[PDB]
DNA sequence: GGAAAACACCCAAGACACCAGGCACGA
RNA sequence: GACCCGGGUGUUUUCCCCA
DNA sequence: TCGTGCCTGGTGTCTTGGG
């Protein structure tokens, strides 16, 4: 659809950052609060973006550019879907897989059901 | 309180008049106590009505 | 320059209470807050933290013989009239007698000399607004009854005209919602309206 | 503070055996330090730490 | 005159009620009471009232000018000529009256405005005309060492703050009293601060926001009368250190000004208030100058 | 639908502010 | 006149209850 | 030995990135 679903919009050039209501933080104990999974994933995505921008302006070995841009693509993809068959999942520091946005919506405990 | 409008810098204003419920007290014409947020109607004049925002003197 | 200016009793009072001597003096009515109730006196607090007291002769009316505690309790603010002010000690005495709390209306000292004041215009406006106050609203009455019909006196008579002698109609009365007019055909072109007084009414529209 | 009652606690913040307790009563009293605010302006030592 | 807006909005408590039905007010007496005319004009500008200027002897002037203008003929032709002249003269009066009324109104407005301007000038001059407090056994104009004590409100949890400034105008030491002001500990600590540290303030200022400060003032006065805290005199009836209330408009405005925050970045607001009080005692003129633009908002 | 129990950024290493002690040195 | 409060994890896992 | 003191070792502190 020309007005609503244009084919080139299927490629992400700007990412919307959801408000903290979507990714609330939890106080694990009386002193230390815990950042949400989406917050950590967005931090990783933003770090990769900064890395790409820094690398591009300074010096451009194509191998390094390919590696860093592929890392950015991986982070953005796993931020929205962490069950992509054929490649390893993104893991937290605790070893558990990251709860992507897609996992929030599916299953008995998902949003809809 | 007079009914006029003024424009002043934030510095010029003295301070907020923090008043406890023991200080912000309103009594109607009949003598019944009326508290903050209650709806009253003007006895005469335009006979308007509204919710009380603040009570002073 | 003149030497340093030392504040006096009036200036100290105005500085502390933020209330001018003119706005707080004899013959003024303020909504004070009751803080302690006793048989022989009541201790009250004004809006500006000025502690006040009233001797037992004025909390209750001179005719009434009740107890101060029964009529007034803690937290029940009432209107009071200033009798005396201790400006140095921020103490005041008040009166709850209605001769002060109610009769004091034209507290302004505006000179009403007829040469420079139009007393007649203010009086005329006063009866205008008083008549406006007297003005009210009224509405019709609805009753559910097989022989009840919302008709005028002439309307009821005309409705009964097409009917034989003895048929009965019921309509609201002009004497009030507590009254009911019953019209029945005495004779051809002859009808009697009888007023019925209602007692123990549950509602205006109710029977 | 919790909405329960702290009057059953001893000096050391622990309830003593033999005391009847009800729901929401405080049986262990514990506090954690917090960096003080600017309340030291005019509070007579009555500032939350 | 009153419009319908004036008929409804002029209430017995409104300031416009003073002239709701005024009539035949002399013009010459208005200049002595400029605020009344200014308030009438303000009410007129609000669409409530209408100010009318009239002359009791207007008919006299009209008749005199007609007699000057009218002809002396008695024939019906002369009667018609006189009627035409009189009608044209009445039309001319009708046209002329509003302009003269407006001119007189503007003249009285200017006169009343100038009178009130001079009155405000005198009031401000009286407000700002005061030399610094003169300690005893010293010449006038000497800057005294001052100590300010304040707690603000007096609710349960209101410590008393003390700020001392020397004659140099620089803060020397600030102290906190965290005990109850009615306790013996408060009095003992205040006496120790006054005497041991060689502070020796020439005058002590006390101020607050409510009547609770009065009890502090009384307690301080009793302490001074009890401990005989006489002022130190550089080298014999030694005089006691005076304790007075302090006007605090400038102090209230200074506790909120960012100038104090830049000057004192690590000090409480009550400390700034006490510093403002002390500076006002040292030099009221400079404190009034420090208001810059907020001085215009003072109740003059 | 109930309950209980165990885990949840740790860290290390390089950079700054303040201090102080035991030894220098004139007398 | 000294005057009384209002706050609660999350994720896994296990063992139970009624069909 | 008395007295003024230096000047660099050290406490306490912290940044901030590795893993």
- Å between E258 CA and nearest CA of chain C: 25
CA dihedral C170, C174, C178, C181 (to 10 degrees): -20
Contact E10, E20 (CB under 8 A): yes
Contact residues, chain C, for B33 at CB < 8 Å: 76-77
Whether there are 3 or more C-beta pairs closer than 8 Å between D and C is no
Strand G contact at CB of residue A30, distance < 7 A: yes
- Using the beta-carbon criterion (under 8 Å), do B45 and E9 form an inter-chain contact? yes
Of C127, C131, B45, C125, nearest in space to E9 by CA = B45
Smallest CA–C1' separation from A32, nucleotide: F8
User: Three-class SS of residue A60?
Assistant: coil
Phi/psi class of residue C201: alpha, beta or left (left: φ > 0; alpha: ψ in -120 to 50)?
beta
User: Three-class SS of residue C195?
Assistant: strand
User: Long-range contacts for C142-148 (Cβ within 8 Å, ≥24 apart)?
Assistant: C142/C205, C143/C170, C143/C172, C143/C205, C143/C207, C145/C170, C145/C207
- Using the beta-carbon criterion (under 8 Å), do B33 and C77 form an inter-chain contact? yes
User: Three-class SS of residue C116?
Assistant: coil
Of D20, D23, D29, nearest in space to D4 by CA = D23
Smallest CA–C1' separation from A92, nucleotide: F9
Does E86 lie at the interface with D, CB-CB under 8 angstroms?
A: no
Contact residues, chain C, for E155 at CB < 8 Å: none
Three-state SS for chain E is CECHHHHHHCCCCCHHHHHCCECCCCCCCHHHCHHHHHHHHHHHHCCCECCCCCCCCHHHHHHHHHHHHCCCCCCHHHHHHHHHHHHHHHHHHHHHHHHHHHHHHHHHHHHHHHHHHHHHHHHHHHHHCCCCCCCCCCCCCCCCCEEEEECCCCCCCCCEEEEEECCCCCEEEEEEECCCCCCHHHHHHHHHHHHCCCCCCCEEEECCCCCHHHHHHHHHHHHHHHHCCECCCCCCCCCECEEEECCCHHHHHHHHCHHHHHHCCCCCHHHHHHHHHHHHHHCHHHHHHHCCCHHHHCCC
* CA–CA distance, E16 with E42 (Å, rounded to integer): 9
Residues of E with CB under 8 A from a CB of B: 8-9, 11, 14-15, 252-253, 256-258, 293-294, 296-297
Phi/psi class of residue D13: alpha, beta or left (left: φ > 0; alpha: ψ in -120 to 50)?
left
- Using the beta-carbon criterion (under 8 Å), do C31 and B23 form an inter-chain contact? no
The strand pairing partners of C94, in sequence order, are C82
- Name the closest residue on chain E to residue C1, using Cα atoms: E131
List the structure tokens of B24: 């912000």
- Å between C32 CA and nearest CA of chain B: 8
Q: Which nucleotides of F are covered by protein (CB under 7 A)?
A: 7-10
Please report, for residues E257, E258, E283, the alpha-carbon distance to residue B11 in angstroms, rounded to integers and kept in the order given.
Answer: 6, 9, 22
The strand pairing partners of E175, in sequence order, are E162
- Using the beta-carbon criterion (under 8 Å), do D40 and E180 form an inter-chain contact? no
Method used to obtain the model = cryo-EM
Tell me, in Å, the resolution of the deposited structure: 3.8
Three-state SS for chain B is CCCCCCCCCCCCCCCCCCCCCCCCCEECCCCCEECCCCEEECCCCCCCEEECCCCCC
CB-based burial, C23-62: b 16+ in 10 Å, e otherwise: ebeeeebbbbbbbebeeebbebbbbbebbbebeeebbbee
Number of C-beta neighbours around residue C185 at 10 A: 21
Which residues get their CB within 7 angstroms of nucleic chain F? A 28-29, 32, 34, 92-94
Whether there are 3 or more C-beta pairs closer than 8 Å between A and C is no
Contact residues, chain C, for E248 at CB < 8 Å: 15
- Using the beta-carbon criterion (under 8 Å), do E152 and D42 form an inter-chain contact? yes
Who's near E239: CB < 8 A, 6+ residues apart? E136, E137, E230, E231
Which of B11, B12, B45 is closest, CB to CB, to E8? B45
Number of C-beta neighbours around residue E55 at 10 A: 10
Which of C4, C116, C121 is closest, CB to CB, to E24? C116
Å from E196 (CA) to H1 (C1')? 39
Write out the DSSP string of C118-171: -HHHHHHHHHHHHHHHH-----------TTB----HHHHHHHHHTS-TT-EEEE
Does E151 lie at the interface with D, CB-CB under 8 angstroms?
A: yes
């Amino acid at each position: 659809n020309e007005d609503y679903a244009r084919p080139e919009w299927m490629i992400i050039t700007v990412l919307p950052v959801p408000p903290p209501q979507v990714r609330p933080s939890i106080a694990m104990d009386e002193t230390t609060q815990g950042q949400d999974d989406l917050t950590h994933k967005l931090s990783d995505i933003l770090k990769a973006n900064i890395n790409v921008q820094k690398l591009e302006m300074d010096g451009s070995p194509q191998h390094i550019i390919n590696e860093v841009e592929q890392l950015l693509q991986f982070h953005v993809a796993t931020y929205m879907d962490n069950d992509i068959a054929g490649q390893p999942q993104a893991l937290q520091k605790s070893g558990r897989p990251v709860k992507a946005i897609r996992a929030r919506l599916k299953g008995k405990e998902g949003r809809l059901r | 309180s007079d009914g006029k409008l003024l424009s002043l810098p934030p510095v010029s204003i003295y301070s907020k008049l923090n008043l406890n419920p023991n200080q912000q007290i309103a009594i109607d014409s009949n003598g019944v106590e009326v508290k903050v947020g209650d709806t009253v109607r003007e006895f005469t004049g335009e006979r308007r009505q509204g919710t009380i925002l603040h009570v002073y003197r | 320059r003149r030497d340093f200016h030392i504040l006096n009793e009036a200036e100290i009072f105005q500085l502390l209470t933020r209330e001018t001597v003119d706005s707080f003096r004899k013959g003024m009515v303020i909504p004070v807050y009751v803080r302690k109730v006793e048989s022989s006196y009541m201790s009250v607090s004004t809006q500006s933290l000025i502690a006040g007291n009233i001797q037992r002769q004025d909390i209750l009316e001179p005719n009434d013989r009740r107890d101060p505690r029964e009529v007034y309790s803690v937290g029940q603010t009432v209107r009071a009239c200033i009798l005396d002010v201790d400006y140095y000690n921020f103490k005041c005495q008040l009166s709850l007698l209605r001769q002060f709390t109610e009769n004091q209306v034209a507290g302004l000292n505006v000179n009403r000399n007829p040469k420079f004041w139009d007393i007649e215009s203010e009086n005329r406006d006063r009866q205008e607004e008083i008549d406006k106050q007297r003005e009210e609203s009224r509405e019709s009455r609805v009753i559910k009854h097989p022989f009840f019909h919302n008709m005028k006196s002439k309307e009821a008579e005309d409705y009964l005209a097409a009917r034989p002698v003895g048929d009965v109609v019921i309509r609201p009365s002009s004497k009030g919602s507590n009254h009911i007019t019953i019209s029945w055909k005495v004779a051809p072109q002859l009808y009697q309206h009888i007023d019925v007084l209602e007692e123990n009414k549950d509602d205006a529209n109710a029977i | 503070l919790k909405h329960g009652t702290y009057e059953k606690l001893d000096e050391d913040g622990l309830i003593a055996p033999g005391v009847r307790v009800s729901g929401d009563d405080i049986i262990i009293g514990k506090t954690t330090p917090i960096p003080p605010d600017t309340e030291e302006l005019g509070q007579r030592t009555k500032y939350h730490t | 005159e009153l419009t319908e807006r004036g008929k409804l909005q002029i209430e017995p408590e409104s300031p416009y009620f003073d002239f709701k039905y005024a009539k035949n007010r002399p013009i010459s007496a208005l200049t002595a009471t400029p605020d009344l005319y200014l308030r009438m004009i303000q009410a007129e500008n609000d669409g409530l009232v209408n100010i009318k200027v009239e002359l009791p002897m207007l008919s006299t002037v009209v008749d005199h000018f007609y007699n000057i203008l009218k002809s002396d003929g008695t024939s019906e032709i002369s009667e018609k000529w006189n009627a035409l002249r009189n009608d044209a003269w009445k039309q001319s009066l009708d046209k002329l009256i509003p302009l003269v009324q407006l001119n007189v109104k503007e003249s009285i407005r200017r006169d009343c405005e100038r009178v009130l301007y001079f009155q405000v000038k005198n009031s401000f001059t009286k407000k700002i005309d005061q030399a610094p407090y003169q300690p005893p056994t010293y010449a006038k104009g000497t800057i005294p060492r001052v100590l300010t004590l304040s707690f603000g409100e007096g609710n349960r949890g209101d410590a008393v703050l003390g700020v001392f400034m020397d004659d140099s105008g620089d803060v020397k030491s600030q102290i906190k009293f965290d005990e109850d002001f009615q306790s013996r500990d408060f009095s003992d600590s205040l006496t120790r601060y006054i005497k041991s540290n060689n502070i020796n303030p020439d005058i002590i200022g006390i101020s607050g926001f409510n009547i609770h400060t009065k009890k502090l003032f009384d307690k301080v006065n009793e302490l001074v009368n009890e401990e005989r805290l006489t002022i130190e005199y550089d080298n014999s009836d030694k005089h006691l250190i005076r304790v007075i209330y302090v006007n605090d408009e400038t102090a209230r405005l200074y506790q909120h000004s960012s100038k104090s925050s830049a000057e004192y970045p690590n000090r409480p607001q009550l400390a700034k208030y006490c510093i403002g009080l002390a500076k006002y005692i040292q030099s009221p003129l400079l404190e009034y100058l420090a208001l810059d633009e907020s001085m215009y908002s003072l109740h003059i």
